[PDB]
Amino acid sequence: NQWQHQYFLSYSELVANFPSPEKVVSDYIKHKFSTTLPWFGWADPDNLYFIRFTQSRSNNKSYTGWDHLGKYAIETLTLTQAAIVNIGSRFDIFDEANSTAGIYKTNNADSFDETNEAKMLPSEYLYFLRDCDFSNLYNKALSDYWAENYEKFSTLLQNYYISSAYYLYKDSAISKDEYEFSIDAIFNKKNKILRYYFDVYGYYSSDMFVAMNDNKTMLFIPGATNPFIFADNITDLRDKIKALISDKNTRELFSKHFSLYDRQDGNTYLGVNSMLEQIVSGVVDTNYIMYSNKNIRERNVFESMAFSTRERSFNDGDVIIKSNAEVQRDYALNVLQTILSLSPIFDIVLPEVSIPISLGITASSVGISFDELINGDTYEERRSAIPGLATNAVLLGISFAIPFLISKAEENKLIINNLVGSDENILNKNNLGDFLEKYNISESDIPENGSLVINLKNTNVPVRLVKLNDEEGEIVAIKGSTLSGIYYEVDTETGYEILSRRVFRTEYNEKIYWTRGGGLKGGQPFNFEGLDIPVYFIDKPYSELASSVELSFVNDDSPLLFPEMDSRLPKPTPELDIKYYSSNLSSFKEDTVILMRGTTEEEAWNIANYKTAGGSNKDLEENFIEAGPQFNLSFSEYTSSINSADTASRKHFLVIIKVQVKYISNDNVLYANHWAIPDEAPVEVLAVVDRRFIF
């Protein structure tokens, strides 16, 4: 079979290539020690230790003028760790820190003095840290990672759904009605099924979703023992949920499916965790579950689950870099919570292959847990060996967990790349004849301007045969992606999507066209030209542009909004002006503000066509209150940040809007330059840019 093996390989390649904050900060410090500050180039920030003491003693021979005893040492961190935990907070005056702290070439020493000192003043290091923005650094890392692996993640998620459903049906854990419901619920061709984001009091889950019809209701929740939970209707589901999160441990595990921001309470409105405690307590009606019921506009639910998980990684990362004081040990793992939840429930089997359960990643009813990796005594040896953990909990995930999981993932991927291959596609110059003879088909059976479906003998996996219009009628086998108009060639023996080799489906004048080279401009479904948008164009990356500066090659990013925003585009309303117009709302209730947002293809089309913030047809309401949360009212969130806009629009679409202030709501203090707006609210769609870069 081995289809399993290709799945695990991709899963491993995802975790292996994920940005570890420790590694990113280390490299950046070496970059600035190589260029901006060459006199420190000798310094390895992962084997030099910033140490803070209570006891101080004069020394005419040291670099600080002081020596210290280890017995009286309060904190012990690597230069990388120190930069991550905003060590500058520990000192009101920098030049004073040299009296109580120092940089040393070891962590274990009775006496910390000139013989183990390092020729760097804490003050120098702190003044260096002030000039650095590690949050922006990790953001650029996450943007590059997603640019490279977004489709890998989406496709893997789709195949995880399929495989878990099939395995459960074979074990007799779900009905065929339930299996049919689950599979049909992806694209919803017959529209016989309703799909909603899973929300709680207007706080939306990153990876969960709900699909229900008058017949049955299902909730998909990744990483649980049973990914899909069925119920006769919405209310039996609500009661099942309340019973499951009746456990404090299980309740926190379920909350791990929400952004760190949404999980914490706000100034005026509450957060997720507290709301769930009150639900089990009974204060909450229990109808507050699925309270917003935001409709899912995209065709494949995994496209939506992917972008939300993507935006959550960005935000969880922003928090983890900014605020890490007095936090839980699992904090930093949230970026990977969703990805690691894709461990296959089916067995795999291979030699010396580390499996999440052998790595402290156990399965539960509401997702995955790390308690064995964090507090389990199995790894307490490794954990105790690492410094800084005793006083900064977050490091458990940064300095121990993330690198451990990534290293074991690399081991796995190297093993499997030896064992298994990636490409077994149709060349047409050979194997085409043998293949068709296997499947009793012929060119006449493959319709021109059409597609032909097959089930593979090995796995019984669907496959699409087509003739290419650009490559001289060459025949290829492909499969649907999570993206509209995008198919991937497949391994003829297993049916696994080959993400490198892609094909584009286009419709025009009742004629279908397939292309390997690039999409055809003017696709009938999502054709924006016909709409009234004033500014619509395809963004061109640095390779198309003739600047030919350093890294001229890059084809995933554009200078559209950075450093200088494009002239063809409207400038965004500054954040302070928006906070003013909202606080003194009486005067500017009807005044307008310009916002940016990174959205999908279908979201931007629904916005420009229906002229609503969230792509909704429904009439808004009467009285136009827009004063906080309201039953069965859904919101989409925009931004004033050029940075966040560029980051969220890369490899996707940008949407700019004019909106009246009477609708925007900003509930949370930390999430700056961002605003929530009802979906049914009206807007003036000013611009739309395609940053898919498909030449």
Side-chain angles (χ1 to χ4, degrees), residues 222-224 253 257 336-338 340-341 361-364 366-370:
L253 297 188
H257 294 278
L336 289 165
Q337 165 74 26
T338 294
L340 300 170
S341 284
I361 285 172
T362 68
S364 73
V366 294
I368 56 177
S369 183
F370 310 100

Side-chain angles (χ1 to χ4, degrees), residues 449-456 458-466 468-470 472-479:
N449 320 358
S451 71
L452 171 50
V453 179
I454 318 168
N455 289 294
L456 272 38
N458 294 24
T459 323
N460 187 28
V461 154
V463 173
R464 286 196 181 279
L465 308 173
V466 305
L468 296 185
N469 299 73
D470 51 356
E472 322 314 327
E474 186 157 13
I475 308 187
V476 292
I478 65 192
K479 208 181 184 308

Side-chain angles (χ1 to χ4, degrees), residues 160-188 191 193-237 239-292:
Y160 163 64
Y161 195 130
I162 300 170
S163 63
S164 302
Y166 200 117
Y167 182 87
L168 269 45
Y169 180 51
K170 284 301 304 181
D171 292 8
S172 192
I174 56 173
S175 67
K176 184 241 177 187
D177 296 358
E178 285 168 341
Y179 175 75
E180 276 187 339
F181 191 111
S182 63
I183 309 318
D184 191 7
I186 296 172
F187 286 92
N188 213 22
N191 281 35
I193 304 171
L194 281 174
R195 306 104 56 82
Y196 306 106
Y197 290 106
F198 186 105
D199 74 87
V200 171
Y201 197 179
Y203 297 149
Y204 312 102
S205 176
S206 94
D207 51 358
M208 297 184 291
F209 80 90
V210 173
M212 69 187 178
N213 71 343
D214 41 316
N215 167 30
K216 231 146 287 187
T217 298
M218 188 196 73
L219 165 56
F220 174 64
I221 183 170
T225 69
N226 186 352
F228 341 86
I229 280 180
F230 291 90
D232 300 311
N233 67 97
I234 185 179
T235 317
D236 180 19
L237 190 67
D239 293 356
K240 283 160 165 287
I241 291 172
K242 176 167 178 173
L244 292 165
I245 76 175
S246 296
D247 184 315
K248 176 183 166 184
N249 204 265
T250 311
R251 182 164 64 266
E252 211 195 64
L253 297 188
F254 180 75
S255 66
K256 257 54 180 297
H257 294 278
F258 292 79
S259 69
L260 289 173
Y261 286 122
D262 301 358
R263 274 204 270 166
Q264 52 180 236
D265 307 342
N267 289 350
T268 324
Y269 308 96
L270 298 180
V272 167
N273 280 335
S274 310
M275 192 63 50
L276 305 210
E277 309 198 278
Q278 298 187 346
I279 286 170
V280 184
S281 318
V283 175
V284 194
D285 312 358
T286 65
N287 200 335
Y288 278 82
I289 288 172
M290 301 305 303
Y291 168 99
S292 193

Side-chain angles (χ1 to χ4, degrees), residues 319-380 382-422 424-427 431-436 439-440 442-456 458-466 468-470 472-492 494-508 512-520 522-563 565-567 569-578 580-603:
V319 173
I320 291 154
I321 304 311
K322 289 174 183 176
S323 77
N324 40 68
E326 232 174 25
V327 313
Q328 282 258 328
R329 315 227 296 186
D330 52 10
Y331 215 75
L333 276 171
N334 295 290
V335 293
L336 289 165
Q337 165 74 26
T338 294
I339 303 180
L340 300 170
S341 284
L342 312 186
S343 175
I345 63 182
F346 63 98
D347 270 12
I348 312 107
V349 326
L350 274 187
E352 282 288 357
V353 163
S354 305
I355 186 71
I357 189 137
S358 69
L359 307 170
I361 285 172
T362 68
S364 73
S365 58
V366 294
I368 56 177
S369 183
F370 310 100
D371 200 68
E372 282 302 308
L373 194 60
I374 298 286
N375 310 305
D377 309 321
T378 309
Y379 295 113
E380 183 60 287
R382 293 175 174 88
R383 302 198 298 280
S384 58
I386 299 185
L389 318 192
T391 58
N392 294 262
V394 58
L395 301 173
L396 274 299
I398 291 174
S399 302
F400 161 57
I402 296 164
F404 177 53
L405 303 159
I406 293 169
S407 62
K408 309 308 282 186
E410 270 286 297
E411 294 175 4
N412 299 6
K413 106 163 191 171
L414 289 171
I415 292 170
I416 300 179
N417 258 255
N418 192 189
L419 300 179
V420 183
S422 68
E424 190 178 45
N425 51 46
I426 291 189
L427 168 57
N431 96 258
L432 173 51
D434 309 16
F435 169 64
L436 65 87
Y439 284 104
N440 301 11
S442 54
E443 284 67 345
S444 54
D445 280 306
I446 277 167
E448 309 296 350
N449 320 358
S451 71
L452 171 50
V453 179
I454 318 168
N455 289 294
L456 272 38
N458 294 24
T459 323
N460 187 28
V461 154
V463 173
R464 286 196 181 279
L465 308 173
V466 305
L468 296 185
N469 299 73
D470 51 356
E472 322 314 327
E474 186 157 13
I475 308 187
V476 292
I478 65 192
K479 208 181 184 308
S481 72
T482 65
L483 306 191
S484 56
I486 290 169
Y487 297 75
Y488 304 123
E489 305 195 42
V490 297
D491 189 304
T492 60
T494 58
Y496 192 98
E497 294 87 306
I498 302 308
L499 308 157
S500 322
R501 322 185 200 256
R502 27 168 47 181
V503 200
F504 305 106
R505 173 181 185 276
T506 315
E507 278 186 280
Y508 195 66
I512 285 185
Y513 302 76
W514 313 91
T515 42
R516 254 183 196 154
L520 299 319
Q524 166 49 18
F526 298 123
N527 170 46
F528 287 57
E529 292 276 42
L531 310 186
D532 67 313
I533 295 153
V535 181
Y536 174 103
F537 64 84
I538 302 301
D539 200 0
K540 291 182 177 178
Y542 296 70
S543 36
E544 311 280 21
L545 311 192
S547 308
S548 72
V549 217
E550 306 160 1
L551 250 178
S552 175
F553 288 70
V554 56
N555 49 333
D556 290 304
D557 211 6
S558 61
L560 184 70
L561 308 178
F562 202 89
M565 197 154 178
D566 194 333
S567 53
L569 287 173
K571 298 292 177 293
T573 304
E575 179 68 3
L576 294 188
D577 304 11
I578 302 152
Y580 202 82
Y581 303 174
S582 73
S583 301
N584 302 320
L585 178 47
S586 55
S587 310
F588 306 97
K589 188 181 108 86
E590 302 300 72
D591 281 67
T592 63
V593 296
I594 303 173
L595 291 188
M596 304 183 286
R597 185 193 182 198
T599 52
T600 81
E601 185 179 25
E602 319 188 32
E603 258 290 280

Side-chain angles (χ1 to χ4, degrees), residues 18-70 72-139 141-188 191 193-234:
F18 196 85
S20 176
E22 182 172 281
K23 166 78 165 171
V24 177
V25 177
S26 161
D27 292 349
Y28 188 78
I29 295 162
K30 298 175 182 170
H31 182 72
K32 304 302 276 294
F33 286 17
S34 283
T35 72
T36 299
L37 299 108
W39 46 94
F40 293 134
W42 51 264
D44 173 15
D46 286 311
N47 280 275
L48 296 182
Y49 298 84
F50 188 117
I51 306 194
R52 215 159 52 89
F53 310 93
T54 51
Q55 165 269 328
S56 186
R57 161 171 152 188
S58 172
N59 185 325
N60 294 84
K61 283 155 280 189
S62 74
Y63 202 72
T64 71
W66 317 83
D67 71 70
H68 313 256
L69 261 175
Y72 295 59
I74 288 168
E75 198 170 16
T76 293
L77 298 168
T78 71
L79 297 176
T80 309
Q81 295 165 340
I84 276 181
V85 312
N86 278 256
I87 195 73
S89 67
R90 265 80 152 180
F91 303 109
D92 315 72
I93 308 90
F94 286 166
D95 288 310
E96 169 175 326
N98 304 330
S99 48
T100 170
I103 316 300
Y104 299 85
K105 290 185 264 183
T106 176
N107 53 313
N108 160 285
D110 271 357
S111 174
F112 284 88
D113 62 73
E114 67 273 20
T115 184
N116 45 31
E117 71 177 351
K119 302 283 181 293
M120 183 160 70
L121 282 173
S123 61
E124 290 178 296
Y125 193 63
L126 301 180
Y127 280 108
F128 159 75
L129 294 172
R130 183 166 60 81
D131 307 2
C132 301
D133 179 3
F134 302 102
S135 182
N136 185 16
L137 178 56
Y138 197 61
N139 195 257
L142 288 163
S143 195
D144 300 5
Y145 169 77
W146 285 115
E148 267 141 28
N149 306 263
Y150 180 103
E151 294 164 278
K152 202 194 243 73
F153 172 69
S154 302
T155 296
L156 188 82
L157 175 53
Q158 184 172 250
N159 289 329
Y160 163 64
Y161 195 130
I162 300 170
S163 63
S164 302
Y166 200 117
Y167 182 87
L168 269 45
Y169 180 51
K170 284 301 304 181
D171 292 8
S172 192
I174 56 173
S175 67
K176 184 241 177 187
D177 296 358
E178 285 168 341
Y179 175 75
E180 276 187 339
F181 191 111
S182 63
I183 309 318
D184 191 7
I186 296 172
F187 286 92
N188 213 22
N191 281 35
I193 304 171
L194 281 174
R195 306 104 56 82
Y196 306 106
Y197 290 106
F198 186 105
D199 74 87
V200 171
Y201 197 179
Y203 297 149
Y204 312 102
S205 176
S206 94
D207 51 358
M208 297 184 291
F209 80 90
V210 173
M212 69 187 178
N213 71 343
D214 41 316
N215 167 30
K216 231 146 287 187
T217 298
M218 188 196 73
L219 165 56
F220 174 64
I221 183 170
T225 69
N226 186 352
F228 341 86
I229 280 180
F230 291 90
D232 300 311
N233 67 97
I234 185 179

